[PDB]
Amino acid sequence: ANPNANPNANPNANPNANPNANPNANPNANPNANPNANPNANPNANPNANPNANP
Amino acid sequence: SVLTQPPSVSGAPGQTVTISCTGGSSNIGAGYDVHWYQQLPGTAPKLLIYGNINRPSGVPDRFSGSKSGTSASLAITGLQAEDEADYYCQSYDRRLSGSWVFGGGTKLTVLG
Amino acid sequence: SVLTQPPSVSGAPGQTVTISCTGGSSNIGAGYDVHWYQQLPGTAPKLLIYGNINRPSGVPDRFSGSKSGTSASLAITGLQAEDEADYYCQSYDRRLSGSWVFGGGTKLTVLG
Amino acid sequence: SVLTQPPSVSGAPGQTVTISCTGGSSNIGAGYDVHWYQQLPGTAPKLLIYGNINRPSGVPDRFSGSKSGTSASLAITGLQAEDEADYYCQSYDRRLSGSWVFGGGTKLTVLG
Amino acid sequence: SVLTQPPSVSGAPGQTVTISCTGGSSNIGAGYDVHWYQQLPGTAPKLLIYGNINRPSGVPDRFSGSKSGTSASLAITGLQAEDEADYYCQSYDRRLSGSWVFGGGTKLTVLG
Amino acid sequence: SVLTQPPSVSGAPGQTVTISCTGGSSNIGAGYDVHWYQQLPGTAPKLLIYGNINRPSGVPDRFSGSKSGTSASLAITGLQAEDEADYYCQSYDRRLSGSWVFGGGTKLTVLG
Amino acid sequence: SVLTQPPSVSGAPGQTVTISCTGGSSNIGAGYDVHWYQQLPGTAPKLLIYGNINRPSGVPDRFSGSKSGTSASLAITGLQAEDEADYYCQSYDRRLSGSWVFGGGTKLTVLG
Amino acid sequence: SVLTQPPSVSGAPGQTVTISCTGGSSNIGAGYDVHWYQQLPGTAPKLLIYGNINRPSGVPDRFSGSKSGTSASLAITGLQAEDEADYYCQSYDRRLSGSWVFGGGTKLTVLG
Amino acid sequence: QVQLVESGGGVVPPGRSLRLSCATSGFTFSNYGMHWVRQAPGKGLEWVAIIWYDGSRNFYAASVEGRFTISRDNSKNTLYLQMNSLRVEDTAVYYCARAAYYDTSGYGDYWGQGTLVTVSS
Amino acid sequence: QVQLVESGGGVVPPGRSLRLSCATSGFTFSNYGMHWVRQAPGKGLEWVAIIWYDGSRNFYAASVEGRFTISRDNSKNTLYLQMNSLRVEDTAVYYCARAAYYDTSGYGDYWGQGTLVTVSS
Amino acid sequence: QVQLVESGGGVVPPGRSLRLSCATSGFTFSNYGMHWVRQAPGKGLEWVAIIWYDGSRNFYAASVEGRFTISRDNSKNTLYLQMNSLRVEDTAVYYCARAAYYDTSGYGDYWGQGTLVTVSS
Amino acid sequence: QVQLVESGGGVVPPGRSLRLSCATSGFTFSNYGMHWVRQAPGKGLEWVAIIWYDGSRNFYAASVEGRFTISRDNSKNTLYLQMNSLRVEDTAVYYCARAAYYDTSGYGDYWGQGTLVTVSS
Amino acid sequence: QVQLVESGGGVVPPGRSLRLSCATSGFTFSNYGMHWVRQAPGKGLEWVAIIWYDGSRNFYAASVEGRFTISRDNSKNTLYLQMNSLRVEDTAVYYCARAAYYDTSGYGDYWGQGTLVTVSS
Amino acid sequence: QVQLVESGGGVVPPGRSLRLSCATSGFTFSNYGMHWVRQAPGKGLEWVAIIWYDGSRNFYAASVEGRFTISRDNSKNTLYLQMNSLRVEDTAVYYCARAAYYDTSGYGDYWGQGTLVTVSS
Amino acid sequence: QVQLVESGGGVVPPGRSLRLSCATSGFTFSNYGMHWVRQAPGKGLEWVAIIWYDGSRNFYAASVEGRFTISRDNSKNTLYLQMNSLRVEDTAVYYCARAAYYDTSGYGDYWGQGTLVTVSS
């Protein structure tokens, strides 16, 4: 049989797909996640804050 | 309207009538589901049949549907006075970029 | 109750019984897992089998199960006096918006 | 001048004209609010709309606004002779070190 | 150019001409669709016929096409002076690693 | 012990031995990395290979490894007297609620 | 030096030369911006391009760059005598604990 | 070697020789294509003819091939000193579980 | 009970914009996609647009793409349709319908009352 | 030892609200999602609702959506179920179960003792 | 209205690189795949490359594979074509087209204006 | 240009394993299937194994099935061959070839350079 | 080497069910179809069932159709034979064989060891 | 045991439609073609229609072609006969039979119970 | 009931082509071959061409072979006839007929209405 990729296929998005949220997903916290401090963030982190005494 | 429906179908009260919906090889003959809607003259459409055999809670047992090959049919048994409404068949057409494709719309009049 | 279970099954002590759970092409025939629970007459359900082959620590080796095609069955060997309970199968059905779908619930009677 | 506003728009008295402020994914498309100010030719700018929907007591009900995606608009209905003033759109830009960013500004002309 | 075409076709105004595009058993004889493009002398190609019979909104009823066996034909009835353009047939060849294969291109000259 | 290892392998000094680690479709076959650890008889484990191909500074070039499918292996060339230690393979199993899963542990004996 | 740069490039006055920075799936191909720095033979480096397309006021319009996939390139057109300097590429690598990662460093020599 | 080839074929420069590759009802008589390869004494095989008639770009016009019934042939017109090599025919045999089947191989000696 | 209410319709001259809204109650808004369907006076039904539950994907009918814009606000449970460059062909009644999916095709289980948008001069 | 202790049941005439609770101990509450399941007297088990570990996603059964509200308090290790406008069909025994996920479907490994709500006139 | 505007052409000596772009407006760029088609002066049309809607798949003609590279940026609605090691045979007019699929084959449903790339020494 | 470079050969005693490799450049690796072919010294060519473009389907010759394993890594453009329980008759030069399909049968358009594997004691 | 090993046999009273299995090693399980063959004591051989390589087609003998069920699971390289409502005539030794096809008829190249199933009371 | 159970009969006035069905169990439905045979009261048997196992080929008697339509759904083991424009001489008892073939002609091995369809006014 | 409807006639100058179609209704089109029969005004009948049910076989009369083409489309139930280089002698009324075979010779059970083709200068 043909072992190569098929170039004659639909290259566009499928509108006939389920548009709703999936109830069959893992509802639990992920234990396999980066536990470290992520040395990539805005180090000048004064971007925008309330300048008044109260929120 | 890629789905073809008869413009009108009539029958006497108490008898059985059938509304057909004929498609092609891209929408119905490709294996996609056919759903039916009912619109009274002055209100929005209401879902009637989904999955080609199933019905919601409010819909009575009188309405039934089926599909086979390239065509699908909606069968109504025991016509009543309130069944005067427009019936639409909806499916998905492989050849377009839209979620739904509707039929022409069949107006049912019971000879009361 | 999408998943179909026989309402009752019985057997003599020391013999083997098989409880069945048959669904459709959307829940069990679609590749989703089947999980079994046991409910004694006056207590909350306990997990019996998960992943179609695995069982918790408290469950003895007598209980076992598997799945094939659209059908999943629970096989129990060495019936005991404490095995009289309601046994449910649970899976996920693709056609609704709920996490779990349960079965009807079989009652196991031990012919003591 | 990170925000873009048309140099000038015009319309007949009493009609509805649209003043639009197109931003980017960093200022408006980032989820930050847009505030509109109306500056009279001979005095300081006056607050017109805050929170993308809220207006002060002095601002009449003709003025209104909304935002979607990376763009926001100011909708003015019933153009009057006193509506001739400069309008500015204000948001916050993540990529800069400024609390506010001001657009080019739109000069509104009423064909009296 | 796996699909071969006549290098030129001419006809007098008001009559019917035919442009053919014959291929092999791997592109047209294998069941793949044939589409037609029209390129006016100084601009980019424009879609003329897709799905072997269908035409877009801008294309008038004069143009039509069909295929049978391993050949596809484009029928133009009632020539005008503005029909002078190159016509290309496009399909998919199973023996290559490309999405489209084009024909040689036929120039139509109307004998005004 | 979700990951399976041979309890012991051996080889004469100067030859090439291969320690394997067999997993399932949930830990190794799901695309998660495999890491190796070496424990001398009287000390704590030491990282040997991380990232399935990478090694720290202290680890010599003799140790190497790769994965394929549901299995990964640690290839050691040029056996030495100090290669007497316990070797553990580690990955993450999607089925539990723990960060790491360890194997049984393979003992390498140098045939001196 | 996870980012790879050519050790030396050359170009005649007035010609166009390109400086390439090659990364991997963790630094450039993972969606992090690439920044370019120019360092004279006797002073500190100075910012030349930030955000893969943007340059400061001091940098002339001759310097321009872009990124694609796992590679980045700095394009310099209209080479001048004062263009002889070391050019560095900087990004962020996911697998390390450093804010910046620099490349090998490219020396541009003008063939005067 | 389900395909049979003569062990050797020789000829002086300037004339035409034929290399035959006979098969059976399962590989060549079953309608499967026949391809040819050339292997110079110290190099890897190079594709010569595919589809029983076609040749790649690098192959000159001297080589041509054809098949009829259960047999295939390779015609080499105008022998040169550089045609000394082994020639292999390849097809697919229905009776095995392999993608390709090769012939015995014919060594061509040019009588210089 | 599921209750979808539309607004924003009215009479507008051709060439300018109009923005509709479909406020919802009685269900979790952020778990479902939404549709827009229009019915011309005396004609059948026509699918207009869809939006995913998270807003990541948008699809439009060929006759309205480039002019219409669909968006949602999960904090106000309100669906929007921004209609620009209106033509006389766009006069119809617009319905918002909650999305559903059975096996291979989707349907609409609950619909709104509908609003009338007319374009004339 | 995982413990799920429930309360909040009783007799309520139809038309008004009732709130349940499921106190937890013996495990990390904030790392797990929770379910609610009911069993009508003499009937089978019916799934009711689920909540994510962070509380971001909530899913309800079609027969209870719009009336029931599930929420959690990660600081008190407690789970709530706020039921409004109770119908006679809502009489059952209510259980809280801890979420789990195997390969492609989820199950409940630890269940609560159960509380019983009667609604009648 | 679907608009495809191209840029980046010019005259280039053989052996070096050139980058084309096709800015887009009037449709949802991220929902569609795109093609590149070139036409040598006085010759017919030749298909060059395709890219999927998400960029996951790329296909090239046999004459340009390994030298050309097609890519897209969905946040700027721009399509690119990186041409390396340009040859004299690559002198043509390049068109960006929008992909469409009917039953068993695909076609190009809107085309761009075209740009001229000249390779000479 | 299509470039296939192989490595991993050498001398190995019978009864134990060996791994070959074939690094690729100049074409899209993830679009094509690959082959392994071997040639015993003084003998003809012999097909060994094939792998699909996505790695879903593997086929082996009868004399090497159960012992040899073929795999690919699309992120490194590398083709592997894991050879286990090597015997004396497995001494040959191994080539990697790129799969092509014409009408009803397949061939290999581009071949590698070849690596020599000797099994001896 | 090809190894087929079965299990699940034993003694069963008539009228009830029993399950057999045939674990495999030494070849690619998902590339082949499998047969079941039985032999009553002191008698000849009898063909029972076949399954396709993907499990799409199953064929059963006339005497066992409607009662026996054949299935495969490509993840564990195992073949199953579910026997329901066993009769006294079903006592025999059951073999699992690997399918091969030559020209117009099939055969079994590799057989198992055999397992004994006795139906008696 | 092969079970063929027909349903859908009754009394219907002439000129309109009726739909029969034949539910199956005890054998692999998708491996067999089916037949419809009718018997007028007091008359002989008459062949009506046959459908292939995959539904690719349909054949009808000359006296019913154009009015009757046979169909099957392999996923529920059901056979259908859609009768349109029912006439008076269409009154008979209809059977569903399982197709069989011996050497050069076909027969029916298992039959259904049969339902009465009466057409009168 | 069998209806054959013909269209596509008219007046055409000699030397060029005209196309005919015979739409079918009332039977399964793919199960039958078809015929074309022509009758010049005042003359008898002449057989033109036959086409098999699957289109594999085609035959033509000696006086029209090499100029006419017969074809069918089984998905639209329509028969075609492409006549190229029409002459004056081709002026007749063309009929489409359904093929039938009795013992050793064929006949046409049902005939179409017919269409008139006029070729003159």
Numbering used by the authors:
A (entry chain I): 138 to 192
B (entry chain R), C (entry chain T), D (entry chain Z), E (entry chain L), F (entry chain V), G (entry chain X), ...: 2 to 9, 11 to 27, 27A, 27B, 27C, 28 to 95, 95A, 95B, ...
I (entry chain Q), J (entry chain S), K (entry chain H), L (entry chain O), M (entry chain M), N (entry chain E), ...: 1 to 52, 52A, 53 to 82, 82A, 82B, 82C, 83 to 100, 100A, ...
Give me lines lifted from the publication on this model:
Many malaria vaccine candidates, like RTS,S, are based on P. falciparum circumsporozoite protein (PfCSP), which is the primary surface antigen of P. falciparum sporozoites, the stage of malaria parasites infectious to humans. The structure of PfCSP comprises three domains: (1) a flexible N-terminus, which contains a heparin sulfate binding site for hepatocyte attachment; (2) a central repeat region composed of 25 to 40 major (NANP) repeats, which are interspersed by a few, N-terminal minor repeats (NVDP, NPDP); and (3) a small, structured C-terminal domain. Cryo-electron microscopy (cryo-EM) reveals a remarkable spectrum of helical antibody-PfCSP structures stabilized by homotypic interactions between tightly packed fragments antigen binding (Fabs), many of which correlate with somatic hypermutation. In each complex, CSP displays some form of helical structure that is stabilized by homotypic interfaces between tightly packed Fabs bound along the length of the NPNA repeats.
Of these, six structures are new, while the 311-rsCSP structure was re-refined from our previously published cryo-EM dataset to achieve higher resolution (3.0 Å from 3.4 Å). Each of the extended helices in complexes with 337, 334, 311, 356, and 239 are right-handed, while the partial, disc-like helices of 364 and 227 display left-handed curvature. T28 is a germline residue that is nearly strictly conserved (S28 in 337), while the S31N mutation is seen in four of the seven mAbs: 239, 311, 334, and 356. We have previously shown germline reversion of the somatically mutated residues that mediate homotypic contacts, but which are not directly involved in CSP binding, abrogates the 311-rsCSP helical structure. Our original mutant 311 construct, 311R, has four mutations in the heavy chain (N31S, R56N, N57K, E64K), and two in the light chain (R93S, R94S). In terms of NPNA4, the apparent affinity of 311R was essentially unchanged relative to 311, while 356R and 239R were ~two-fold higher (improved) and ~two-fold lower than 356 and 239, respectively. Strikingly, however, 311R, 239R, and 356R each showed a consistent and dramatic reduction in percent inhibition relative to their WT counterparts, which was statistically significant in each case (Mann–Whitney U test; p < 0.001). While there is a range in the level of inhibition, many antibodies are highly potent and have statistically indistinguishable protection relative to mAb 317, namely mAbs 356, 311, 334, and 364. Conversely, the long-range CSP helical structure could be biochemically stabilized in a designed construct to specifically elicit highly potent 311, 356, or 239-like antibodies.
